[PDB]
Amino acid sequence: ECRQMFGGCTKDSECCAHLGCRTKWPYYCAWDGTV
């Protein structure tokens, strides 16, 4: 139960591994470095 790349988050904590949520609009689980 985690959120994949390009899924709308509220925070990194609501993303799958290898992703860091944008802390700006739009807020999606985004490519941190690997994916």
Contact 3, 14 (CB under 8 A): yes
Residues β-bridged to residue 29: 21
For the chain, give every domain's residue range.
1-35
Q: Chain-centre distance of CA 8, in angstroms?
A: 7
**To 10 degrees, the CA torsion angle through 9, 16, 6, 32?**
100
